[PDB]
């Protein structure tokens, strides 16, 4: 009972196409991960199982690496965790890269788990490796990952008899490179990485007709515009706040392809993204390397101090449509929200609104969430007509990008009903 099918494309490998016309908001596929793990920066901040941020988390007894919010989460995680637990115990004080911990979970799921529904349309065995396009530099990095894997997993995997038949570690890490999904929480904070082999049939577009969203580790795939019969389904692999040049480099380095899409041919939005003084935004782009690192580790006080030094600098400033200024405004808004500084969060949040409209066209889940945050801030401060306007805009977007199957849509409906009741009274 599916509206999509695998097919062989003319020049981008296998892909997914619609077998019937699709309309905005239509759910096309949903999947738990084949395997997933919390990311470096969120380890110890979010529960290893449900990926939610809780202040009280309990370490697993044996390895004291995995953390859980509840007995329920520890129990539901134990099948995925039992064999890596001894390895993490084996390997402390060292912690292995996310990709190595992820592939460990793949190998254990394929060795010990029932066939996974995440592989319904496409399996880990099927995934693109791009090995004949990897540079010598990439291949050397892959060889280091293999040896790191062999080290980390020695307590549980000694020889090939404990790997799937004809399982090649080098090809396996090559697949992880170009098929890994970044798992975001409801607030669009990156909290994990996973493999979803059926979803990995989707080729990329800088102007996609589909979008994915995460509800915990669970993934929803939705159409975000009208799609004709037989049309290829695409998602955007990349953050929207990137120039065509930046997209080219990342698509080359990680995915081994050159994008022929119409936005890349025309450098669509590049000029407006880079307005302001070049010397100023080069420095902000540098500072953002540390700001985003701090944010990935949830160090909100330090994020905020670094952002304020830019937003309210004594030296030259950038227009809010400059993508690097815009990223700074967004980091500062999220830090204020997490620190309970709601007046400041709203000031930064409202400044992001018009640039987000430009740079996230149509229905994009990231703009839907940003608008909902600004609406919620306005609601908590008693600005009801303005909050209502933004909450309704968020719903117009998120009914398409998130849908009834995403728990966040229920929370938005509650905010809509509360803010409406405040206006009616
Ligand atoms: O209150 C805040 N932050 C917050 C506060 C004021 C203004 C803007 C944001 O976080 C609480 C957290 C816990 N939920 C409490 C209510 C239902 C159960 C879960 O959910 C969220 O609101 N996050 C969220 C996610 C996406 C978009 C907007 C907000
Ligand atoms: C997640 S996989 C998508 C499915 C892939 N086509 C396959 O056959 O398995 C990502 C890989 O698909 C290819 N690809 C994805 N989007 C592309 C595009 N827009 N143009 C050319 N190749 C693309 C690249 O090889 C990339 O590394
Ligand atoms: Zn949990
Ligand atoms: Zn453990
Ligand atoms: Zn493109």
UniProtKB/Swiss-Prot annotation:
Binding site for S-adenosyl-L-methionine: 12-14, 122, 130, 179, 203-204, 237, 257
Keyword Transferase included in the entry's annotation: yes
GO CC aspect terms: cytosol; nucleoplasm; nucleus
Main location group: cytoplasm
UniProt-listed SUPFAM superfamilies: SET domain
Residue segments, region C-terminal domain: 270-425
Record-linked Gene3D superfamilies: 1.10.220.160, 1.25.40.970, 6.10.140.2220, SET domain, Tetratricopeptide repeat domain
Binding locations of Zn(2+) 2: 60, 63, 81, 85
Subcellular locations according to the entry: Cytoplasm; Nucleus
UniProt keyword annotations, A-Z: Acetylation, Chromatin regulator, Cytoplasm, Metal-binding, Methyltransferase, Nucleus, Phosphoprotein, S-adenosyl-L-methionine, Transferase, Zinc, Zinc-finger
Regulation: Histone methyltransferase activity strongly stimulated by HSPCA.
BP GO terms, sorted: cellular response to dexamethasone stimulus; establishment of protein localization; methylation; myotube cell development; nucleosome assembly; positive regulation of transcription by RNA polymerase II
Keyword Metal-binding in record: yes
Ranges for domain SET: 2-238
Coiled coil: none
Protein name: Histone-lysine N-methyltransferase SMYD3
């Amino acid at each position: 009972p599916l509206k999509v099918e695998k097919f062989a494309t003319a020049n981008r490998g296998n892909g997914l196409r619609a077998v019937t016309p699709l309309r905005p908001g239509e759910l096309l596929f949903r999947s738990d991960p084949l395997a997933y793990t919390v990311c470096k920066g969120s380890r110890g901040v979010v529960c290893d199982r449900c990926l939610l941020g809780k202040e009280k988390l309990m370490r697993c007894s044996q390895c004291r690496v995995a953390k859980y919010c509840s007995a329920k989460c520890q129990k539901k995680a134990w099948p995925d965790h039992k064999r890596e637990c001894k390895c993490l115990k084996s390997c402390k004080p060292r912690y292995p890269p996310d990709s190595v911990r992820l592939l460990g979970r793949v190998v254990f799921k394929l060795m010990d788990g029932a066939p996974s529904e995440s592989e319904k349309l496409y399996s880990f065995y099927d995934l693109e490796s791009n090995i004949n396009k990897l540079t010598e530099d990439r291949k050397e990095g892959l060889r280091q990952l293999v040896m790191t894997f062999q080290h980390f997993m020695r307590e549980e995997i000694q020889d090939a008899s404990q790997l799937p038949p004809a399982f090649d570690l080098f090809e396996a890490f090559a697949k992880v490179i170009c098929n890994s999904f970044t798992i975001c929480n409801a607030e669009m904070q990156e909290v994990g990485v996973g493999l979803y082999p059926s979803i990995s049939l989707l080729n990329h577009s800088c102007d996609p007709n589909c979008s994915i969203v995460f509800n915990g580790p669970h993934l929803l795939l939705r159409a975000v515009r009208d799609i004709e019969v037989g049309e290829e389904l695409t998602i955007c692999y990349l953050d929207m706040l990137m120039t065509s040049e930046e997209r080219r480099k990342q698509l080359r380095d990680q995915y081994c392809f050159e994008c022929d899409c119409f936005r890349c041919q025309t450098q669509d939005k590049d000029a407006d993204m880079l307005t302001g003084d070049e010397q100023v935004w080069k420095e902000v782009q540098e500072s953002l390397k540390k700001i985003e690192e701090l944010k990935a580790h949830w160090k909100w006080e330090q994020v905020l101090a670094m952002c304020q030094a830019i937003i309210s600098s004594n030296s030259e400033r950038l227009p809010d449509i400059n993508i690097y200024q815009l990223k700074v405004l967004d980091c500062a808004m999220d830090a204020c929200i997490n620190l309970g500084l709601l007046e400041e969060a709203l000031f930064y949040g409202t400044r992001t609104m018009e640039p987000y409209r430009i740079f996230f066209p149509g229905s994009h889940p990231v703009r839907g969430v940003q608008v909902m945050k600004v609406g919620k801030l306005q609601l908590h401060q008693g600005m009801f007509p303005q909050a209502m306007k933004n909450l309704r805009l968020a719903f117009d977007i998120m009914r398409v990008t998130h849908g009834r199957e995403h728990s966040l849509i229920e929370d938005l409906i509650l905010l809509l009903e509360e803010c409406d009741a405040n206006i009616r009274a």
